[PDB]
Design a protein around this ligand. Structure first.
Ligand SMILES: *[C@@H]1O[C@H](CO)[C@@H](O[C@@H]2O[C@H](CO)[C@@H](O[C@@H]3O[C@H](CO)[C@@H](O)[C@H](O[C@H]4O[C@H](CO)[C@@H](O)[C@H](O)[C@@H]4O)[C@@H]3O)[C@H](O)[C@H]2NC(C)=O)[C@H](O)[C@H]1NC(C)=O
Ligand SMILES: *[C@@H]1O[C@H](CO)[C@@H](O[C@@H]2O[C@H](CO)[C@@H](O[C@@H]3O[C@H](CO)[C@@H](O)[C@H](O[C@H]4O[C@H](CO)[C@@H](O)[C@H](O)[C@@H]4O)[C@@H]3O)[C@H](O)[C@H]2NC(C)=O)[C@H](O)[C@H]1NC(C)=O
Ligand SMILES: *[C@@H]1O[C@H](CO)[C@@H](O[C@@H]2O[C@H](CO)[C@@H](O)[C@H](O)[C@H]2NC(C)=O)[C@H](O)[C@H]1NC(C)=O
Ligand SMILES: OC[C@H]1O[C@H](OC[C@H]2O[C@H](O)[C@H](O)[C@@H](O)[C@@H]2O)[C@H](O)[C@@H](O)[C@H]1O
Ligand SMILES: OC[C@H]1O[C@H](OC[C@H]2O[C@H](O)[C@H](O)[C@@H](O)[C@@H]2O)[C@H](O)[C@@H](O)[C@H]1O
Ligand SMILES: *[C@@H]1O[C@H](CO)[C@@H](O)[C@H](O)[C@H]1NC(C)=O
Ligand SMILES: *[C@@H]1O[C@H](CO)[C@@H](O)[C@H](O)[C@H]1NC(C)=O
Ligand SMILES: *[C@@H]1O[C@H](CO)[C@@H](O)[C@H](O)[C@H]1NC(C)=O
Lengths: 395, 394
């Protein structure tokens, strides 16, 4: 979407995976979907270095709305969970140097059953803009046809544009066309800053594998369409929660960087381990994700339960991820000819290789004809950055 | 099996899940299947308190033997990787106060392709006993018929007995019987100290779930057959490796205790986190697994992506495990009437409840009519011990 936004993948925090649709503030006030939850996350995004690392969008997902629209046909924030309203929340978030995301649905209801935006696109867009909303995640539940789906996504895009406010537009458009209708990504990209292609992530390694396998399976269709202003969205980072081993967390962080994915954490910033914090704030890995060239990576090869992915970067550099998909045994040796990497230009005549994950380590100079040996933990990933030696010497 | 062994579930260490069939001592000397690997694990089993916690059997799995039998038809320790032989290794292990486990296969080959024991049951049994072997894991690969399968497991059982040496007998009989017909567990119990029922575990939450779901689905067939001398074997503990979140590791430890499972760790004792060590060595959880009554637990109820399991213990006590199977969101509250637990006798007229996992905490006294509320992490388990107040006052 040509709105000057998402020139690199959007980074922030989104409540959904970790907090879901918890409406019980009586029994669980510290985990219910409430203004207090978001104000606390906003404070910690500043104080715990998240904003500094690049995470700037504090985003509300489903279940913020009151059951009905007001007498002027406007969406309402829930009166008891958001008693001070969205505007005051937006002001609070802005005072921290952060941006606010909100959620709506193209159909008659949100996925959780609250008011949908169909028939109210213009009113809702103007409502969000006036509040100072900076991002909209627009979901595709409760839509009677694919024609109405597409039209609704386009209408809301134009309506947001007409407000004159810069608002990141995140769409679930192509997801709802799966598996029989092939999305027109040229069209989707014209209207959206990012788009969900695949089913919801959850707190499991199985879901991460499924997203990676569906991405690589469809990579010819989707990789080249991504770029500054329009990204493939493989869903939230779930690092720091309950269902992932350390190696699986490393794999998600590495691969979301390779995929030029928007980076929306869904976790509890009040209760997150130092290790998970350090991984999510990894300066070098975020720099790969945020690479200005904005070319999405891809799976180069797979076999013997190993996967090699790579991403072209600015300065003729490359990021390379090697995944051990064998879920038994110990750290497993993997050897690759560097000549196979980066279309055969990355290490011609030579490259300098730095390992970034699971630990940072300068590996040295590798000539065009040489081989690279790594040991990779089961379900883990080794992430490397390759610099072509001619680029290095030249200023 | 009535050999006086495995009166409580066997505890030890087994190489397979972590080290597999690594034969490359040239490129990977620290992880190849070699005498040095087992000697190092033996030292650490003592020095790091594993033996003291109850882990006493140091077990060799597949890929210890040479490609061929010797001219006397004996299995041979691989000459490059076990140059000093198994006898010397057994002597070394015994000197540490530990017991040695070894591996063979009922069919023509082991699963990795090494010589199988078919046609050699007596020779192999005598070979093992002479060496000082204390446990045999007997796998079911490359067996052409169900008759040869059953007869082979029976033959080896009797052959080990005939040596006069006490040897724990671990069988894959029901597992290899399953793809064809329901096993006869009465017969299996007669011949085996423990038996593998289900597919191999690996370093994944997926495999743990599959084992639990298979066990709970088939619990009517298998729970009551287990007891002192003969246990259901849901495979190795994989805590301390690569593929499990902390919550998933807690779940495995808790449920292997509920299930009265043999506890064979498969991990690298040279490189194990303090957290994983403390869980695997948890004295209260091990005491549940090792409960002298030896009655296997079971799934009590299931629904709303929660599972409740319980195990009767000696002295009118109960272990209760609550699993959160919802793999999204946060810690989820689960409430149960205590009158539903322990067939309604656990907390009549009251019980004292202590949480053991994920952290140890006394919860208090609960009347028969009361409800217990717990918050459980996604893929995690809360493990409780219930003590009846009648028993406490006595
Ligand atoms: C509503 O829709 C309209 C029409 O699509 C949209 O107008 C577009 O806005 C973008 C972004 O502001 C314009 O793109 C800019 O064009 C100018 C002149 O060519 C450039 O100088 C800009 O360069 C930026 O990006 C560079 C890197 O690529 C940076 O180095 C530099 O610093 C600049 O930031 C940029 O390319 C685009 O021209 C218009 N399109 C048209 C046809 O008018 C408008 O923004 C939308 N409004 C809202 C509120 O959404
Ligand atoms: C080869 O197979 C034979 C026959 O299957 C097997 O002989 C059996 O050994 C067991 C265990 O030693 C015997 O059971 C014991 O019998 C004695 C005497 O009657 C009892 O004292 C024991 O009672 C309990 O008390 C012990 C407390 O110290 C406990 O340790 C024990 O587990 C009991 O709870 C016990 O019942 C059994 O009598 C024989 N069976 C026959 C038919 O002789 C033999 O052990 C096998 N040999 C090898 C080397 O494996
Ligand atoms: C996918 O959508 C794009 C954009 O709507 C289509 O490309 C346009 O095609 C129309 C004619 O139908 C032309 O007027 C425009 O010039 C095209 N725009 C661009 C930017 O290419 C494209 O035809 C669609 N692809 C398919 C196969 O349906
Ligand atoms: O309600 C917010 C939710 O909306 C979308 O997901 C809808 C449903 O998708 C799957 O069926 C999933 O199993 C359910 O949990 C969920 O209700 C959206 O894709 C999500 O990201 C989220 O915003
Ligand atoms: O070779 C030792 C091994 O033997 C048995 O497992 C054989 C194979 O079973 C499955 O196909 C599995 O996927 C493989 O990893 C495995 O090699 C036995 O059940 C194992 O415990 C182990 O002893
Ligand atoms: C919403 O419901 C109305 C009335 O049933 C229907 O006409 C309309 O097409 C629906 N909108 C969508 C996008 O499903
Ligand atoms: C082993 O192979 C021989 C020769 O093919 C065969 O007679 C025998 O039945 C096999 N044994 C088993 C148990 O598979
Ligand atoms: C199991 O085998 C035993 C022989 O040890 C036999 O007595 C028994 O009838 C079998 N069980 C059933 C119910 O088929």
């Amino acid at each position: 979407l040509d709105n000057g936004l998402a020139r690199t993948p959007t980074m922030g925090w989104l409540h959904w995976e970790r907090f879901m649709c918890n409406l019980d503030c009586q029994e669980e006030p510290d985990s219910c979907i409430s203004e207090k939850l978001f104000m606390e996350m906003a404070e910690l995004m500043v104080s715990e270095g998240w904003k500094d690392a690049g995470y700037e969008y504090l985003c509300i997902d489903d279940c913020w709305m009151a059951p009905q629209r007001d007498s002027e046909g406007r969406l309402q924030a829930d009166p008891q969970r958001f008693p001070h309203g969205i505007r005051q929340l937006a002001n609070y978030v802005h005072s921290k140097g952060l941006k606010l995301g909100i959620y709506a649905d193209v159909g008659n209801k949100t996925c959780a059953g609250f008011p949908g935006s169909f028939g109210y696109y213009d009113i809702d867009a103007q409502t969000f803009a006036d509040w100072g909303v900076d991002l909209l995640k627009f979901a595709g539940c409760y839509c009677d046809s694919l024609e109405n789906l597409a039209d609704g996504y386009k209408h809301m895009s134009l309506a947001l544009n007409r407000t004159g406010r810069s608002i990141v537009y995140s769409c679930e458009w192509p997801l709802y066309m799966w598996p029989f209708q092939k999305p027109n990504y040229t069209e989707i990209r014209q209207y959206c800053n990012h788009w969900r292609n695949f089913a919801d992530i959850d707190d499991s390694w199985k879901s991460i594998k499924s997203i990676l396998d569906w991405t690589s399976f469809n990579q010819e269709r989707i990789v080249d369409v991504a770029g500054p202003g329009g990204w493939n969205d493989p869903d939230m980072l779930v690092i720091g929660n309950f269902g992932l081993s350390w190696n699986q967390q490393v794999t998600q962080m590495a691969l979301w960087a390779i995929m030029a994915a928007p980076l929306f954490m869904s976790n509890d910033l009040r209760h997150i381990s130092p290790q998970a914090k350090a991984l999510l704030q990894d300066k070098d890995v975020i720099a790969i994700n945020q690479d200005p060239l904005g070319k999405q990576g891809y799976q180069l090869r797979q076999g013997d339960n190993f996967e090699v992915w790579e991403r072209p970067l600015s300065g003729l550099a490359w990021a390379v991820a090697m995944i051990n998909r064998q879920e038994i045994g110990g750290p497993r040796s993997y050897t690759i000819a560097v000549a196979s990497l980066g279309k055969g230009v990355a290490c011609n005549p030579a490259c300098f290789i730095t390992q970034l994950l699971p630990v940072k380590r300068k590996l040295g100079f590798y000539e065009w004809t040489s081989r690279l040996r790594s040991h990779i933990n089961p379900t883990g990933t080794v992430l490397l950055q390759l610099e072509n030696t001619m680029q290095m010497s030249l200023k």
